């Protein structure tokens, strides 16, 4: 681990992670229900930390779209956030992955996707890496 | 460790980061903030000469081309050529500077004042009617 500072004199812990995202290497993972709230996702993003919006709190693309739009309205221009989807909830994936693809194609500030509660197959992971327009992919091996 | 109710998320996350900074500063930088290296901006790093001229060919490597145009120093020109995305209000779109300077046969990029960021000029020249 290293220290680095920017022009403004802000010090960062410098790791492989912090060097990618330009923020402290500290994240609030997706939690149903704690990070389903757009207000908490926005507060943490505005604090300068990476947080996953929990898909576990959402049942359709429309409901998750309204939550994402609420986060985007409350975060500063140039801020980003991630989405946590649950791999053992095939229904969530079925509306969740097309939604992220579509919002990323519209340029929504979704930096990454974390898949909780299972690791996708090589074929599925390839689809997520190549099609979703994400900076990185979060995996949570058990 | 969950003891203090209604601590702002900023105080919790900052408290952890500032704790790490303090401990690294003591252990690895002799309690001296002046030994911390500075960069213009921190981020955008994938985990994997004053006057110059670059000529694109059919076989020119895209990553090597953009590294060369970017330069070594972290400044506006590094961001211009290596950021995959730029911001349009709150949206994140593909870096248009990378699209425009995508290398192809006939493209000639002259960098002038490459060492002084404030004065650097990157000039793309292409064949126009011969």
UniProtKB/Swiss-Prot annotation, chain B:
**Lineage start:** Eukaryota, Fungi, Dikarya, Ascomycota, Saccharomycotina
- Which organism is this protein's natural source? Saccharomyces cerevisiae (strain ATCC 204508 / S288c) (Baker's yeast)
Name of this protein: Fatty acid synthase subunit beta
Q: What does this protein do?
A: Fatty acid synthetase catalyzes the formation of long-chain fatty acids from acetyl-CoA, malonyl-CoA and NADPH. The beta subunit contains domains for: [acyl-carrier-protein] acetyltransferase and malonyltransferase, S-acyl fatty acid synthase thioesterase, enoyl-[acyl-carrier-protein] reductase, and 3-hydroxypalmitoyl-[acyl-carrier-protein] dehydratase.
The family note in this entry says: Belongs to the fungal fatty acid synthetase subunit beta family.
Supply any other comment: Present with 91800 molecules/cell in log phase SD medium.
Q: Partners and quaternary state?
A: [Alpha(6)beta(6)] hexamers of two multifunctional subunits (alpha and beta).
């Amino acid at each position: 681990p290293k220290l680095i500072k920017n022009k403004s004199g802000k010090i960062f812990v410098e790791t492989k992670f912090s060097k990618l995202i330009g923020r402290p290497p500290l994240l609030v993972p997706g939690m149903t229900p704690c990070t389903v709230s757009p207000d908490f996702v926005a507060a943490t993003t505005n604090a300068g930390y990476t947080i996953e919006l929990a898909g576990g709190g959402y049942f359709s693309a429309a409901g998750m779209t309204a939550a994402i739009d609420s986060v985007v309205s409350q975060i500063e221009k140039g801020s980003t956030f991630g989405i946590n989807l649950i791999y053992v909830n095939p229904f969530m994936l079925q509306w969740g992955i097309p939604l992220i693809k579509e919002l990323r194609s519209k340029g929504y500030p979704i930096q990454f996707l974390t898949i909780g509660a299972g690791v996708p197959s090589l074929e599925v992971a390839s689809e997520y890496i190549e099609t979703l327009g994400l900076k990185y992919l979060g995996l949570k091996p058990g | 460790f969950t003891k203090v109710i209604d601590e702002p998320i900023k105080s919790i996350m900052d408290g952890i980061h500032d704790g790490h900074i303090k401990k690294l500063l003591h252990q690895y930088y002799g309690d001296d903030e002046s030994k911390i290296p500075a960069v213009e901006y921190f981020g955008g790093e994938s985990p994997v000469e004053d006057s110059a001229v670059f000529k694109a060919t059919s076989s020119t490597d895209e990553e090597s081309w953009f590294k060369a145009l970017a330069g070594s120093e972290i400044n506006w020109r590094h961001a211009s050529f290596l950021c995959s995305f730029i911001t349009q209000d709150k949206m994140f779109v593909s870096n248009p500077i990378r699209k425009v300077f995508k290398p192809s046969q006939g493209m000639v990029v002259e960098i002038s004042n490459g060492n002084t960021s404030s004065k650097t000029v990157v000039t793309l020249s292409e064949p126009v009617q011969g």
